């Protein structure tokens, strides 16, 4: 696309600048360009891709939730009719969010996942796939909602199976996957008990492996463990 004429290394360099500038839409466009060069991504480059799109979609999700809350108050008893505008604007934001999710899913399908053989890369991309189907599920209503939820579940489950076989229980990628799959269970799949069990099991298995870690790896792992604990505290 518009990045086709820019060097791969320059796209990555500019993604890093955009991050520093808090220009996340630019960051995401640079990283899309880098992916579309066709080469596999390094660990650092995967992280840049993730950060860029997570920030873009996160802003959209936050706006969607504000608009949805105004829309659902408009649809209460005793609410004055104010016309189509709230729905139309919610729809506009929703369609943009869906477009971003579709963009990310398209990068994963063409061709990041199929070229990813190492557990670090494959788990990362499958977790991403689950996340972006999860964001689609948050706004889905209507006939494909079940299928979207199933797509998220399937991606997460494939990532889980690989991570349990190939990574230690403290690996930050494995931990973040488990965190996000637990969120899926609680918030999307109407399975709070599964969410709680996964978070508990994950936390406890990681605890038991901390003794193997350097000081720096310990800090990395315990940061995510704390998030599992924060959700457990919220959910119980």
């Amino acid at each position: 696309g518009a990045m086709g004429s820019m060097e791969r290394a320059s796209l990555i360099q500019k993604a890093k600048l955009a991050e520093q500038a808090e220009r996340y839409e630019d960051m995401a466009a640079f990283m899309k360009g880098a992916v579309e060069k066709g080469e596999e991504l390094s660990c650092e480059e995967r992280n840049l891709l993730s950060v860029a799109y997570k920030n873009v979609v996160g802003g959209q999700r936050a706006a969607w939730r504000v608009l949805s809350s105004i829309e659902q108050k408009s649809n209460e008893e005793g609410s004055e009719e104010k016309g189509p505008e709230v729905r139309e604007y919610r729809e506009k934001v929703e369609t943009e969010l869906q477009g971003v999710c579709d963009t990310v899913l398209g990068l994963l399908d063409s061709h990041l996942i199929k070229e990813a053989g190492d557990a670090e890369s494959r788990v990362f991309y499958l977790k991403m796939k689950g996340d972006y189907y999860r964001y689609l599920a948050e706004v889905a209503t209507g006939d494909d909602k079940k299928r979207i939820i199933d797509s998220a579940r399937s991606a997460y489950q494939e990532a889980m199976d690989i991570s349990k076989k190939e990574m230690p229980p403290t690996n930050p990628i494995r931990l973040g996957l488990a965190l996000n799959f637990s969120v899926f269970h609680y918030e999307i799949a109407n399975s709070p008990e599964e969410a709680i069990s996964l978070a508990k099991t994950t936390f406890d298995e990681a605890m038991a492996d901390l003794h193997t870690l350097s000081e720096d790896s310990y800090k990395d792992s315990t940061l995510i463990m704390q998030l599992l604990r924060d959700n457990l505290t919220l959910w119980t």
Binding site: S50, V51, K54, N55, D131, L175, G176, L177, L179, N180, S182, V183, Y186, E187, A195, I224, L227, D230, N231, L234, W235
Partner: peptide, 8 residues
Amino acid sequence: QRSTSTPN
């Protein structure tokens, strides 16, 4: 509160 997912 909404649940916390993995941060950047």
